[PDB]
């Protein structure tokens, strides 16, 4: 990544590398994997981002979907930012493929990211990757919120956990009280109805405790 | 977070990230998880705080209660601190949503936290989160102190552990001798009665050892 | 804690935090936990010390005894050092509750600890905590030294280990040859008697090997 | 490796050393081992690269293939860059065997890598090694893409994972929609045929979900 | 410990603390524990050395022998270096109890160790401790070298391992070919006799392979 | 070790210490242990090298062979470099025993290693140790290359792994195609014969796949 000390390039650490590999091995593409990726790739160059994605073994259906998303965003970038035999020793303008690190060198990437003003190719590429990762999360979300209904003897708290877990995956962690009540079991629904509208989640959970 | 070297921004470390994820996985929302969160988020930006909260998988009923608490505190902040097309290159005043990191950039957050004098948006947001976490702890406290009574053959020490464990959860670690005696078993109660008032916990525990 | 680079404040590390939590989980309040706490809290602010104590789940009977000890020492501090509407921008004198971190801010704590000359509130508070921890160790010491006697077929070395383990807990690691001999079994006692007085532990152990 | 602070030599870290040894022990020569090697050997001298390769126990058939590849590339380097009793205290030009670290000292390697302009012998040697590693990956790829066909009751997602896993190994992670459809089972093939051409992978996977 | 940056005091690290605790837990007082202690206590103050010794739970017979050894060496130090109401703001001369850290403060210890010329109280105290540890190792050595004899079907290599393991413990790793031959089994003894004198260990082991 | 910042002495790290102990515990004296030792002892003083060797428990037959090798090399050093009551405050010339750290202090070792020009006693001693370690590896190599022959149903790849593993141990990783073919089973030998001479290992392995 690029870090302070002056802004200088640093090697990706074994700790960072292992942390990413392990979270994928344990969590696959549960929603919480996205903010972990984002956090672990803080200051990342496009090379660093490709490194992290490449260290993943398996999950290749998802990674191909990721590739396709990246290619679309790169095509759109080029449409919005067309580049014009470059002047000797001068910084060239990055194309989509340069941002994704397929046609740019590390030194070029460092040049853009540390320029004044910077062309933040690390942040732009991360944005495309996170967009692709959110799509994978939505695809792999196993259950519709319509099918999350409280069991006859399921504690209300356990039901609320499932409801908001499902909502998070279906929306890729991007921001329902009435539906929560509607999908509650008849005993807790009666109690929640009696609370009326404007009840907080805390109050609803206390009531069905 | 923001740290010294001059006050500069640093990437959240994999060690910090993993420590938070693991403590939640092992301890859920036992009271001791709060001071761990506070300690692990030392110097945290609002982005860092959202990162830590987002890395948590599951417990989504609690996180939604947390969200609601944050939104209330943000609404109250705006009521107390209304903001007035900003002057070119000047620092704007943070709204509630800027403190919670939904409408502020990392650079803006860095600007407020390192300003002279600082607008400590990291500390303000942490305060709202801890307030929400304490409510979760109180909600998930399984037992009333009224039901913590010493067993006929339960060692006094074991009883005192349960009593103060329960008191801590019920009060979210925010600061009873008579009730302790009252809920003791008849043999130890007789002994403690004979000690009289003004006995320390140490003396009470020695007496029923 | 406060450390050198100039004396500056640093965030407590995840390594330190986890080390303390784990040693308590594994060793409870065996004597060796005290020097570990002292070592892990090197340079600690009162906030850091409260953090470490708060990260402990369970053992709440002991922590309440710790609280009581802290409150006594704070009351005594105030008796010895009474404080007199403070001058603008000037350092106030710490009360007992400021040293224990209940009524002082981190910035105030940093101010006292790094002042010239320093008011070492971190060291003063640690002293009160260690005093409380030593009392817990003495309370939880399961066996009197009077009951540590060598078994008929127990190796002398194994007996000496138990004797000095017990002595350490009973005295909270704060500094017997005749009693060691007296509590030895008849065969080793005969041999040790024949060595006479002035025998070192090494010589005694060699003799009953 | 060589790193910034001025460009200076640093000892390879135990963390780096162990990370490489462990990834080989767990993953052998699965494709994802290559980007891990590349990442762990960031800034590596030829000595460092030989160190990492030498710390591997077993897999000696592969390492001999690696040796042969390195020797070929070294022979080609010498053909392209012939060297001409060197001037006192002056930098000599590296031969193939100097780049591979068999006939060069660490100090010479440091001299080339930190020269102005640099002769990047660490990067040149890594390139030869990665070339050899990609060949090992292609050799050890157990299955042809022609044999990856969707099972009668195999979920489409599971099939796509195998297809792109196989494609990655066969091509050593160096960059098929029609073949994917062709190798799908009759039920999903019917559905995919009906989507027509121009369908993204996402759309194809949604359709056969 | 005291380290470079100027010679400054640093807190003992959790890594160092845990490494010492664990090596004792796993190896007790096998000979190899001594050089580990010495290495882990590099630059240690007397306080640091007491910390490390105090973090050990159990083994209290050995630690009491250690105490006695330390007290003897302290008594001898005072005999050799008698100290003479000290001049204001001046460095006092350390007594035995100051070197062992029972009557000296950390600041005094830092003063002696970083003085010009230094009074290396950390190194002097470590020397006394290692002397005591070597005695513990000799005491706990379970077997005399006279009882290490090669089994009828024991591989010569396995016998040599036991012989030199025993010799190391008996001598506390402080520096026999004829005895090695003498204690060999009749078949290997015949072969070694035929080699004659002046045979290296390598040659002897090859011969009885 | 000695490292850059100016060349200064640093304490050997707990990570380094543990890494060496563990690799020996897991790998004994498999060939790959040598480059690990070399890598872990980067910049090592003779004291550091003795530390690492001393932290090893067991394997004492091998360590005695190591001792003997070191003593021979020290004797040869003295023969080649005889030393001549030294001038006050001046650097003395190191003897063999000074290089091996038996008669030299750490400060003397630091003096030689950081002198201009340096007398690299750390590198000289490491060379003697590695020479001794290579001999141990050759001694403990369990199998002659003459006995590595492909099984009737053993995959060619598995056979090549054994062949080059054996060759590495027999030669202590110091640099056969005809012998590889000669020791292949009759079916693969027929195929390899038909390839003719000049076949690479890759081609041979593809042919017998
Ligand atoms: C964790 C989570 N669950 C969801 C369910 C449905 C939709 C989105 C989500 C999210 C992501 C989610 O909303 N995460 C929060 C952080 C957070 C996490 C946990 C508790 C409180 C705050 C976040 O990133 N931001 C910017 C945020 C902050 C305050 C209020 C609203 C949003
Ligand atoms: C740990 C704990 N148990 C409780 C039970 C009921 C109510 C609150 C709690 C707490 C939190 C709790 O009180 N923690 C203590 C720190 C502490 C922890 C353990 C032992 C001694 C001191 C704390 O944070 N502060 C500021 C404090 C310090 C000294 C006296 C009183 C309070
Ligand atoms: C470890 C231990 N066991 C005891 C039994 C009864 C009373 C006290 C104790 C102690 C604490 C104990 O005495 N620890 C020792 C350090 C130590 C530990 C182990 C071996 C040698 C020295 C200590 O802290 N100091 C200051 C000390 C140093 C030298 C002589 C006497 C005391
Ligand atoms: C991971 C993978 N699977 C493959 C299958 C066939 C051929 C090659 C491969 C690769 C390597 C692979 O292509 N890795 C990608 C990084 C990557 C990994 C995972 C998802 C998205 C991007 C890469 O290194 N680069 C330079 C790249 C970046 C964007 C588009 C195309 C290529
Ligand atoms: C490891 C060991 N085994 C022994 C058996 C009997 C007596 C002493 C010992 C020792 C300690 C032992 O001798 N350790 C060696 C280091 C060493 C360890 C292993 C192999 C080679 C060199 C040592 O510390 N020094 C100073 C040394 C160095 C070279 C020659 C002689 C001594
Ligand atoms: C790993 C190994 N196996 C062997 C079998 C017989 C003889 C020696 C060995 C060695 C040591 C071995 O040769 N290691 C290689 C590094 C290496 C390791 C693995 C693959 C490619 C290169 C090495 O140290 N050097 C200097 C080297 C580099 C390029 C060509 C030839 C030698
Ligand atoms: Cl893969
Ligand atoms: Cl979730
Ligand atoms: Cl608790
Ligand atoms: Cl091998
Ligand atoms: Cl103990
Ligand atoms: Cl040993």
Residue numbers in the entry:
A (entry chain A), B (entry chain A), C (entry chain A), D (entry chain A), E (entry chain A), F (entry chain A): 1 to 5, 9 to 87, 90 to 180, 186 to 219
Task: Give verbatim excerpts from the published study on this entry.
Here we report crystal structures of assembled HIV-1 CA hexamers with peptides comprising the linear binding epitopes of NUP153 and CPSF6 and the two antiviral compounds PF74 and BI-2. To attempt to explain how these diverse phenotypes are achieved, we carried out interaction studies using a CA that can be assembled into stable hexamers through the formation of engineered disulfide bonds at the NTD-NTD intrahexameric interface. The structures reveal that the binding pocket identified for CPSF6 in CA NTD is actually part of a much larger protein-protein interface that also accommodates NUP153 and is present only in assembled CA. The complete binding site is formed by NTD helices 3 and 4 of one CA monomer (referred to as the ‘first site’) and NTD helices 2 and 7 and CTD helices 8 and 9 from an adjacent monomer (referred to as the ‘second site’).
Complexed structures of each drug with hexamer were solved in a P6 spacegroup and their mode of binding compared. Analysis of the hexamer:PF74 structure reveals that, in addition to making contacts within the NTD of one monomer, PF74 interacts with the CTD of an adjacent monomer. As a result of this reorientation, the 2-methylindole moiety forms a planar stacking interaction with the side-chain of R173. Cation-π interactions such as those between arginine and tryptophan can contribute significantly to binding energy, and computational studies suggest that in a solvent-accessible environment they are twice as strong as a typical salt bridge. This indole re-orientation not only allows stacking with R173, it also reveals a hydrogen bond between the indole NH and Q63. Whether interaction between Q63 and PF74, despite being absent in the monomeric crystal structure, occurs during binding of PF74 to monomeric CA is unclear; there may be a requirement for hexamer both to supply R173 to orient the 2-methylindole and to position the side-chain of Q63 for hydrogen bonding to PF74. Together, these extra interactions seen in the context of the hexameric complex structure most likely account for the significant increase in affinity seen on binding of PF74 to hexamer vs. monomeric CA. Nevertheless, superposition of the P6 hexamer:PF74 structure on the orthorhombic uncomplexed hexamer structure showed that the interaction between PF74 and CA directly displaces the stacking interaction between R173 and Q179 that stabilises the ‘closed’ interface conformation, with the 2-methylindole taking the place of the glutamine side-chain. For this reason, PF74, like CPSF6 and NUP153, cannot bind to the hexamer when CTD helices 8 and 9 are in the ‘closed’ conformation, although we cannot rule out the possibility of additional interactions between this region and the drug. Finally, the tetrahydrofuran derivative has lost aromaticity and therefore the ability to form cation-π interactions and has the weakest affinity for hexamer, reduced by >1000-fold.
